[PDB]
Design an enzyme around this catalytic site. Sequence first.
Site, PDB file in Angstrom:
ATOM      1  N   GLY A  31       3.446   5.828  10.134  1.00 55.98           N
ATOM      2  CA  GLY A  31       4.556   5.742   9.798  1.00 55.98           C
ATOM      3  C   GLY A  31       5.409   4.725  10.016  1.00 55.98           C
ATOM      4  CB  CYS A  58       3.206   0.550   7.205  1.00 56.61           C
ATOM      5  SG  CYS A  58       1.440   0.434   7.732  1.00 56.61           S
ATOM      6  CG  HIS A  60      -0.450   0.355   2.476  1.00 56.45           C
ATOM      7  ND1 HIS A  60      -0.422  -0.989   3.468  1.00 56.45           N
ATOM      8  CD2 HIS A  60       0.312   1.064   3.060  1.00 56.45           C
ATOM      9  CE1 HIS A  60       0.188  -0.514   4.523  1.00 56.45           C
ATOM     10  NE2 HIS A  60       0.673   0.768   4.374  1.00 56.45           N
TER      11      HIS A  60
HETATM   12  C1  LIG Z   1      -3.927   1.471   3.269  1.00 56.91           C
HETATM   13  C2  LIG Z   1      -4.351   1.174   4.637  1.00 56.91           C
HETATM   14  C3  LIG Z   1      -4.152  -0.293   4.849  1.00 56.91           C
HETATM   15  C4  LIG Z   1      -3.305   1.818   5.365  1.00 56.91           C
HETATM   16  C5  LIG Z   1      -3.234   1.488   7.107  1.00 56.91           C
HETATM   17  N1  LIG Z   1      -4.769   2.091   7.376  1.00 56.91           N
HETATM   18  C6  LIG Z   1      -4.920   1.905   8.933  1.00 56.91           C
HETATM   19  O1  LIG Z   1      -4.355   1.571   9.601  1.00 56.91           O
HETATM   20  C7  LIG Z   1      -6.506   2.255   9.017  1.00 56.91           C
HETATM   21  C8  LIG Z   1      -6.526   2.860  10.517  1.00 56.91           C
HETATM   22  C9  LIG Z   1      -5.617   4.099  10.477  1.00 56.91           C
HETATM   23  C10 LIG Z   1      -5.079   4.396  11.477  1.00 56.91           C
HETATM   24  C11 LIG Z   1      -4.124   5.532  11.815  1.00 56.91           C
HETATM   25  C12 LIG Z   1      -4.077   6.169  10.744  1.00 56.91           C
HETATM   26  F1  LIG Z   1      -3.346   7.405  10.605  1.00 56.91           F
HETATM   27  C13 LIG Z   1      -4.751   6.145   9.424  1.00 56.91           C
HETATM   28  C14 LIG Z   1      -5.656   4.975   9.302  1.00 56.91           C
HETATM   29  N2  LIG Z   1      -7.157   0.646   9.247  1.00 56.91           N
HETATM   30  C15 LIG Z   1      -8.294   0.487   8.792  1.00 56.91           C
HETATM   31  O2  LIG Z   1      -8.792   1.311   7.965  1.00 56.91           O
HETATM   32  O3  LIG Z   1      -9.072  -0.597   9.136  1.00 56.91           O
HETATM   33  C16 LIG Z   1     -10.127  -1.020   8.387  1.00 56.91           C
HETATM   34  C17 LIG Z   1     -11.471  -0.152   9.183  1.00 56.91           C
HETATM   35  C18 LIG Z   1     -12.255   0.746   8.431  1.00 56.91           C
HETATM   36  C19 LIG Z   1     -13.240   1.401   9.003  1.00 56.91           C
HETATM   37  C20 LIG Z   1     -13.531   1.288  10.317  1.00 56.91           C
HETATM   38  C21 LIG Z   1     -13.005   0.155  10.891  1.00 56.91           C
HETATM   39  C22 LIG Z   1     -11.726  -0.414  10.522  1.00 56.91           C
HETATM   40  C23 LIG Z   1      -2.385   2.593   7.760  1.00 56.91           C
HETATM   41  O4  LIG Z   1      -2.658   3.631   8.134  1.00 56.91           O
HETATM   42  N3  LIG Z   1      -1.264   2.162   8.326  1.00 56.91           N
HETATM   43  C24 LIG Z   1      -0.128   2.803   9.135  1.00 56.91           C
HETATM   44  C25 LIG Z   1      -0.186   1.984  10.464  1.00 56.91           C
HETATM   45  C26 LIG Z   1      -1.247   2.388  11.655  1.00 56.91           C
HETATM   46  C27 LIG Z   1      -0.943   3.685  12.146  1.00 56.91           C
HETATM   47  C28 LIG Z   1      -0.957   3.382  13.618  1.00 56.91           C
HETATM   48  C29 LIG Z   1      -0.431   1.925  13.609  1.00 56.91           C
HETATM   49  O5  LIG Z   1      -1.010   1.334  12.444  1.00 56.91           O
HETATM   50  C30 LIG Z   1       1.347   3.278   8.557  1.00 56.91           C
HETATM   51  C31 LIG Z   1       1.327   3.440   6.902  1.00 56.91           C
HETATM   52  C32 LIG Z   1       0.166   4.273   6.308  1.00 56.91           C
HETATM   53  C33 LIG Z   1       0.775   4.975   5.346  1.00 56.91           C
HETATM   54  O6  LIG Z   1       2.192   5.059   5.581  1.00 56.91           O
HETATM   55  C34 LIG Z   1       2.727   4.175   6.701  1.00 56.91           C
HETATM   56  O7  LIG Z   1       3.421   3.962   7.062  1.00 56.91           O
END
Ligand SMILES: CC(C)C[C@H](NC(=O)[C@H](Cc1ccc(F)cc1)NC(=O)OCc1ccccc1)C(=O)N[C@@H](C[C@@H]1CCCO1)C[C@H]1CCOC1=O
EC number: 3.4.19.12
Lengths: 305, 301
Positions: free
Chosen positions: B143, B145, B41
């Site tokens: 950040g 991931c 992603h």
């Molecule tokens: C492309 C996505 C896989 C990226 C990933 N989405 C998520 O986690 C999101 C939540 C979120 C948390 C914090 C944020 F700020 C932004 C979003 N989940 C999700 O929609 O669940 C499904 C759902 C949806 C609706 C209701 C219930 C559940 C993502 O934000 N991953 C980051 C790691 C996270 C941040 C905190 C620890 O884990 C790091 C990535 C993103 C870009 O660069 C990186 O390093």
Amino acid sequence: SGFRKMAFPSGKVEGCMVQVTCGTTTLNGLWLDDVVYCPRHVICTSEDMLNPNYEDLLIRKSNHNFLVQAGNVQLRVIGHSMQNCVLKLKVDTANPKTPKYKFVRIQPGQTFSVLACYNGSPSGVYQCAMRPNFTIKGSFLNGSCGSVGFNIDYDCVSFCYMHHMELPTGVHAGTDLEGNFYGPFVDRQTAQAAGTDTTITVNVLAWLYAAVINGDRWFLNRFTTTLNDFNLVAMKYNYEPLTQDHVDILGPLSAQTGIAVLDMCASLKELLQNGMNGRTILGSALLEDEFTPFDVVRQCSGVTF
Amino acid sequence: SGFRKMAFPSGKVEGCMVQVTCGTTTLNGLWLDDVVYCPRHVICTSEDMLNPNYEDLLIRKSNHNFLVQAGNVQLRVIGHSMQNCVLKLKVDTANPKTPKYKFVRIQPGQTFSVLACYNGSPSGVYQCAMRPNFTIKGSFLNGSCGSVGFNIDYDCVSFCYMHHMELPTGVHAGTDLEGNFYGPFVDRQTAQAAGTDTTITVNVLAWLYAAVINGDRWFLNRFTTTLNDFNLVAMKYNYEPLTQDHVDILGPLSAQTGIAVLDMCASLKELLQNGMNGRTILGSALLEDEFTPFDVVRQCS
Ligand SMILES: CC(C)C[C@H](NC(=O)[C@H](Cc1ccc(F)cc1)NC(=O)OCc1ccccc1)C(=O)N[C@@H](C[C@@H]1CCCO1)C[C@H]1CCOC1=O
Ligand SMILES: *[C@H]([C@H](C[C@@H]1CCCO1)NC(=O)[C@H](CC(C)C)NC(=O)[C@H](Cc1ccc(F)cc1)NC(=O)OCc1ccccc1)[C@H]1CCOC1=O
């Protein structure tokens, strides 16, 4: 989000651990520049540990009495001296992996990471706190002496602890890297016990702020307390007194969460009188006191090293 | 003596962490040999996060669209491919710090160490368990991931986890290093939730043995139980069922301590019924389930 007992990355320290053998005693040493540091009781036999005369034992030992092994390479010892309870072995080769480092002495309540080692090889890392009674509640087996504790600030490793002994309660005592013991202990196998341990109040408050930041705010209340009234309660539960310095340090967390320190103190005071009432905070049924205010800010802001 | 939640030394993994940037997204990559692994992603745009077509998005990218930085050196990307939910970037340089390593997929209840990283730089290391609902209770900020979970055996690093996302309860989901998610989760920001979390019963029993090994016996009792009766009771506390395989795995600890497995099970039944009554076990007022039988043997011996 989330909150864990997090240790510093240990790579910079792993590159400094070596094995030191004198006679039949083998333990770990810390190889920095052209010197290996280790506990002075490495020169003791199983029978010399009861009433050792370290002057006498060391005078009778020679450079070649010490076998230093960095991995599968043997370092040539070209000198040896003693500083307090630490032995210093000069070797003919500077450690090419020496990091930027300082020797620092920490105070009770401060946290650090422990790299537990055996036979010069790192086996595990965990985060500890220097208890108010100057012990640490570690995890150490025989052969772990010479394991070190450290912090990382910027790109500089601050060495603060070297492991020496275990006390009858299963808690652990050691020195700074200049060989000065933490607490009223001596490196002899005579009867010793640590004083009553107290709770690090300022760390408990920092951890309650981390709990609020992570969405646990069930324990809050509308009330406040004075520092004097709180300390009257805290001293009755073996809690360390809270000073104005402690309050100032929690300012950042106080502002971030909108909860005054004395408001959190009221929460903690009530938690002490009533308990947690079947509830948990950040996944714990106890009041955690091994997170400093900086630790909470560091983990909640993603600082890297 | 003593017993702590202990992580593996992280140096071998620190030497593999790099920063990967695609467009405006920057996250962590794992640099092993001449390949950098990171979550796919990284190629998503702000508008593509709900229903991305990763095949289509990747086809449109060129090698120069990926900026990989190992410290202050930029690695030249000479190829890219996708394996499930993981992106593989071929670089023109093999990582000289590559350790002996394996890719392994772990099972619920197994433990591992997490090296939390930001912008390719490690911030901390902590020990985790794969929960029965296929999440982990980590500590991750934006950040993070590409941060990885791992074990070390001898001098071989077994990579088992790469972090991808956070679910509404604050728990975390990710993949193995072959890009297959643990659990039924997908790298899309559509509504997802983890199932009810249960307690890893076999790990709790191992930890009670660790307490006995460390000299604590206040929670034992004179009773024994059948395996079926224990599981009937335990499941009422949201505990995972204990299988005969689990019992076999606890054999060594049972022999070391002289306490039959089903006798320890009787002790756990009483602890669930009574609570700790102001006491602690190995410095905890809760029943800890993030130590495996293997973990207990390693730390206590
Ligand atoms: C492309 C996505 C896989 C990226 C990933 N989405 C998520 O986690 C999101 C939540 C979120 C948390 C914090 C944020 F700020 C932004 C979003 N989940 C999700 O929609 O669940 C499904 C759902 C949806 C609706 C209701 C219930 C559940 C993502 O934000 N991953 C980051 C790691 C996270 C941040 C905190 C620890 O884990 C790091 C990535 C993103 C870009 O660069 C990186 O390093
Ligand atoms: C390491 C070892 C570390 C220790 C072992 C278990 C975890 O920590 N240190 C010692 O053994 C140390 C050595 C003397 C200072 C010279 N002595 C002790 O730790 C003893 C207790 C002990 C002894 C053997 C063990 F296997 C475990 C614990 N401390 C002690 O005697 O306390 C005072 C006391 C005496 C009698 C009654 C009450 C209190 C190094 C030791 C040799 O090689 C190493 O790596």
